[PDB]
Design a protein around this nucleic acid. Structure first.
Lengths: 142, 185, 44, 179, 68
RNA sequence: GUAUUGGCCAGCCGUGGUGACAACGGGUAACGGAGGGUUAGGGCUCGACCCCGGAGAAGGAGCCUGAGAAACGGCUACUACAUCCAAGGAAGGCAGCAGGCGCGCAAAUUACCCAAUCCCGACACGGGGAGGUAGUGACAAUAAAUACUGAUACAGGGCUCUUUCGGGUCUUGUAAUUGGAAUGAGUACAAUUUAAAUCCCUUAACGAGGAACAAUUGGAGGGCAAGUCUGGUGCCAGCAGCCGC
């Protein structure tokens, strides 16, 4: 209650909606284009990078395990990120300087599960595909 | 002047030309790609140099006066090992960081190891024969604090078979001497 | 935690699991025939 | 720009609903369909009719748009046979249901007029070049037979059942046994 | 089916047929022979080569003797 | 001065013009529109791209011919790249069709032809990478293969005679038996298709009995449909959009 209701008050109603629309969080990040600027990916879906070293990451408080992440430097703009290697015993397939391909966890810029500070996962290594190697459908080229 | 990465490629090509039938099925022999020989130093089993058993681009050269352990491993499985099983092998690090231990029990074992074994590897039974009976707490504490290194058993996949041969060679100034050669192998 | 951990233990369980083979079984009908068998069991 | 395309089915919003899951399976088994898609396709083409009738019903009576389009819609349904002549009213098309459309298709019409032992036997006879309507050979199970063409379904002239010559395996057996 | 549909043309006189029919139809009936020509690229290549010669392009060997 | 109007330009003379009904300036991962996607109604979002209008041919300026150009498969000059050379000199502009390099998560053949739709010229006759046909192609959309049916037994369901292992009647199921016919997936004499071919559509001789002429991708604690069965591991290895194991 308290809106202008007259027949010639179309200017105030249109102006008010424009100003208060910024209080929304989903719309505010769309208008300013933060993804184009701050996100390591240039607003894209995938990216290619070079593996630097293998790192183990501890799980959060209730759990206890080693998550076995990896360090990657992006070819497109030279930034450095960390990515998670899914499935059981798959670090064995990746070596140093292996040209991996990455994607997201699907939480749209937030960490998934108990893994802290990790936002990406490895999809392909040496252009073969990680899951295909796991089921012994293909052999990794030398 | 032999290049260690080139040696690895030659070793791999000879072994991989063989195959073996086990229970009616034929299995290629695969090198265990994450095992390697090494140089030997005074009172220290592992130096800084590795001798791979697959082709690599390691260009480090062997030099006059060096001694190397040349060992190879073959497998009918994946050609890769992981650590699994009960731990028996330990060794004091020569480069161990200085630490202060609240637990007195560790303080006594550390003195025993340095005075008896130094940096030589030891096993559990070598402690038993010295009359140590209540040492497991202290040993695990020394590992956690970075003072002693553990070496769990290394296994390939269940149902696979592995073999090993190794010799020590001396790269003397005059000639090469294969010191461990015998009439057996 | 100077030790931090050890990455050697990757793939322990999958490597040491026993291996057992598929056993041959009769082929199942497919397409429209497979739907016909399902309908009879759940309503007749 | 110059090519036109359309898709003929829709997907339900809730994927796993117990009440809906078994209802469709009963229809599939009854008429010997291949999968759930043909059930959804019939539901969509029935929904288009309802929307057109509902739009016209809110119009005033004797409105020229309502009369012209209402009569055309009614005549089309009577001609195909999914609606009986006793009820020519725009309100009665809203009461149509899914099973009415499935009655008037070539696969079921083969069953009703003899010519087959099981509803699954009818489909394999349609796909093979056996059934003909009028003078044209039809191999489309969902032909949606019209009313006045119902009295001309018969075996093909060249089919072994309606004449012709013995088929592939019968000839070999006769020839092999002969010599 | 056993039905077939096509097109037919009936001409007043045989001479009138050859006057109006396209050549490719005549070859089908055998009345006329095919035209022999080279492929389309070689004809185009030759045409552009002759734009660099001015007058009596048929023989241009008179310039062979300039070198002596 | 211009094809013509005009602060478009030259002299002389006035002091004006826009703005809270948002001027001026900065951003645009901005060519505009017809329109695409999603729907109770009201809306939100996209539009380089087959139709219409505007601009450009590596970056800037200048000009000739002509009814029409500030043209680049026309010329002159500078800047940046780059070609041949006997060292004096000469020549170049694929955001036209194919093709190569680089960049990237990301996109096809250096193939055939004027037969069709149309355009140009002195012309009924010549030309057209405009345009059409084929190759590669799981971008999307439409139709719909992977089997059909008897008999004899057993089992159960429906009804009766009805006392129970009892009999007549129909359906369904088969690590139960034998018994039937049919079809294209391919393939190949012909004709047809086409500028010449291929494909489709018709059609002689061949083409189904299981280890095939063998369907996969994700799941079985809850949201959410489907095991509390049997081996391995033992907060390790790992799963898990969320609660969790």
């Amino acid at each position: 209650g308290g809106k202008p209701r007259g027949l010639n008050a179309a200017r105030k109603l249109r102006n008010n909606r424009r100003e208060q629309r910024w209080a929304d969080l989903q719309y505010k990040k769309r208008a300013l284009g933060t993804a184009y600027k701050s996100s390591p990916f240039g607003g894209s879906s995938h990216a290619k990078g070079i593996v630097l070293e293998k790192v183990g990451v501890e799980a959060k408080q209730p759990n206890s395990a080693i998550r076995k992440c990896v360090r990657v430097q992006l070819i497109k703009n030279g930034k450095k990120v960390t990515a998670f290697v899914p499935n059981d015993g798959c670090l064995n397939f990746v070596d140093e300087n292996d040209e991996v391909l990455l994607a997201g966890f699907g939480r749209k810029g937030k960490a998934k599960g108990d893994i802290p500070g990790v936002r990406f996962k490895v999809v392909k290594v040496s252009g073969v595909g990680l899951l295909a190697l796991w089921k012994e459908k293909k052999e990794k080229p030398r | 002047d032999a290049r260690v990465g080139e040696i690895g490629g030659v070793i791999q090509e000879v072994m991989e030309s063989y195959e073996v039938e086990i229970n009616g099925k034929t299995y290629p022999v695969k090198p265990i790609r994450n095992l390697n020989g090494h140089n030997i130093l005074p009172y220290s089993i592992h130096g800084t140099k590795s001798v791979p058993i697959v082709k690599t681009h390691d260009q480090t050269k062997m030099e006059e006066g060096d001694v190397f352990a040349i060992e190879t491993f073959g497998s009918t499985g994946k050609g890769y090992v992981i650590e699994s099983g009960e731990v028996s092998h330990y060794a004091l690090r020569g480069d161990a960081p200085k630490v202060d231990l609240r637990l007195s029990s560790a303080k006594s074992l550390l003195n025993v190891i340095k005075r008896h074994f130094g940096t030589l590897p030891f096993c559990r039974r070598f402690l038993d024969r010295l009359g140590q009976e209540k040492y497991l707490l202290g040993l695990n504490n020394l590992v956690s604090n970075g003072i002693v290194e553990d070496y769990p058993p290394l296994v390939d996949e269940k149902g696979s078979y592995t073999a090993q041969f190794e010799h020590t060679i001396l790269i003397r100034p005059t000639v090469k001497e294969v010191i461990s050669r015998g009439d057996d192998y | 935690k100077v030790a931090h951990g050890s990455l050697a233990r990757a793939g322990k369980v999958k490597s040491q699991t026993p291996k057992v083979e598929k056993q041959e079984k009769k082929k199942t009908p497919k397409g429209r025939a497979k739907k016909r068998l399902t309908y009879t069991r759940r309503f007749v | 720009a110059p090519r036109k395309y359309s898709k003929t089915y829709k997907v339900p919003r809730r994927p796993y609903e117990a009440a809906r899951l078994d209802s469709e399976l009963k229809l599939v088994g009854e008429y010997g369909l291949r999968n759930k898609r043909e059930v959804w396709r019939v539901l969509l083409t029935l929904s288009k009719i309802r929307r057109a009738a509902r739009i016209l019903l809110t119009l005033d009576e004797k409105d020229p748009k309502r009369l012209f389009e209402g009569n055309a819609l009614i005549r089309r349904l009577v001609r195909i046979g999914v609606l009986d002549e006793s009820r020519m009213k725009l309100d009665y098309v809203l009461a149509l249901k899914a099973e009415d459309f499935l009655e008037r298709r070539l696969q079921t019409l083969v069953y009703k007029l003899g010519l087959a032992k099981s509803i699954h036997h009818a489909r394999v006879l349609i796909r093979q070049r056996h059934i003909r309507v009028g003078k044209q050979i039809v191999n489309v199970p969902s032909f949606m037979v019209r009313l006045d063409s119902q009295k001309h379904i018969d075996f093909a002239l060249t089919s072994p059942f309606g004449g012709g010559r013995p088929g592939r395996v019968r000839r070999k057996k006769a020839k092999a046994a002969e010599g | 089916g056993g039905k077939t549909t096509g097109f037919a043309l009936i001409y007043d006189s045989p001479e009138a047929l050859k006057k109006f029919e396209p050549r490719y139809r005549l070859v089908r009936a055998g009345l006329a022979a095919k035209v022999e020509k080279a492929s389309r690229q070689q004809r185009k290549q030759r045409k552009n080569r002759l734009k660099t010669l001015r007058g009596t392009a048929k023989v241009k060997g008179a310039k062979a003797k300039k070198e002596k």
